[PDB]
From a paper:
PEAK proteins are a unique group of pseudokinase (PsK) scaffolds that can self-assemble regulatory networks. In addition to the conserved PsK and SHED domains, all PEAK proteins have an N-terminal intrinsically disordered region (IDR) replete with short linear motifs (SLiMs)—conserved sequence motifs that can that form dynamically regulated docking sites to recruit interactors involved in PEAK signaling.
The second region we identified was a “tandem site” that comprises two directly adjacent motifs that were both conserved: a PRM known to bind CrkIINSH3 (consensus motif: PxLPxK); and a putative binding site for 14-3-3 proteins (mode 1 consensus motif: Rxx(pS/T)xP). This tandem site was found to be conserved not only in vertebrate orthologs of PEAK3, but also in vertebrate orthologs across the PEAK family. For each isoform, phosphodependent binding was observed and the PEAK3tandem-pS69 phosphopeptide consistently showed ~10-fold tighter affinity (KD ~ 0.16–0.78 µM) than those of PEAK1tandem-pT1165 or PEAK2tandem-pS826 (KD ~ 1–10 µM). We also solved two crystal structures of 14-3-3ε: PEAK1tandem-pT1165 and 14-3-3ε:PEAK2tandem-pS826 complexes, which were lower resolution (3.1 Å) but similarly confirmed phosphorecognition and a canonical mode of binding. In each of the three 14-3-3:tandem peptide structures, no clear electron density was observed for the adjacent CrkIINSH3 PRM likely due to flexibility and crystallographic averaging. Proteomic analysis of insect cell derived PEAK2IDR1 showed phosphorylation of the tandem site 14-3-3 motif (RAASSP), whereas phosphorylation at this motif was not observed for PEAK1IDR1 (RANTEP). PEAK3 appears to be unique from PEAK1/2 in its interaction with 14-3-3 at the tandem motif, displaying ~10-fold higher affinity for 14-3-3 (PEAK3 pS69), compared to either PEAK1 (pT1165) or PEAK2 (pS826). For PEAK3, the pS69 site is sufficient for stable 14-3-3 recruitment, whereas the longer IDRs of PEAK1/2 are predicted to harbor additional 14-3-3 motifs and different mechanisms may exist.
Residue numbers in the entry:
A (entry chain B): 66 to 72
B (entry chain A): 33 to 72, 76 to 232
Write the structure that this text describes.
Amino acid sequence: RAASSPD
Amino acid sequence: MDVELTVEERNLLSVAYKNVIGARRASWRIISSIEQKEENEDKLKMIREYRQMVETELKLICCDILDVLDKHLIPAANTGESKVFYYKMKGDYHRYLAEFATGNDRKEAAENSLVAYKAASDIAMTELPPTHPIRLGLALNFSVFYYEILNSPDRACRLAKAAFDDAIAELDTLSEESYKDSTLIMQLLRDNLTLWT
């Protein structure tokens, strides 16, 4: 529901 | 009991493990959505049996990764970049544990997440430029932790805005070939802000 850091 | 990883090695291992963990997380969310709809005899049971089957695997991975962070990787971190990286990883995996933990476990994990995140922050703000991709990813995941776990949109938006403004300030004095990286995390932070607000 909310974007975290790309990994 | 010590291991040191080059930036490339730890980046590649991180990509692999978080690919796996994201697959499992999305599967868990979908099984939960199925459970909620059917709840609103034998089907639901099996559904729960799959959810309990997912939760276990997830845990087994996250726990197993955190051990390797604590017993091996975090102690053997010279550069501040790698220190912030490993502490952010610890916070991220404790966050994933809290995302589905029930009871005081959800409390437990949450604490161990924050203590990790704060840790990385206390290094980043004194070791990495505001433009550094590690620091920006840390701030983004930390604001996500604030908004979604601790249910604090205020602290989340505060952290996101602070990180974005410090970045956009130090942006003018930054090489292009060293700013194209920060671009994407900065834009993600901006999108998260526009959504939360």
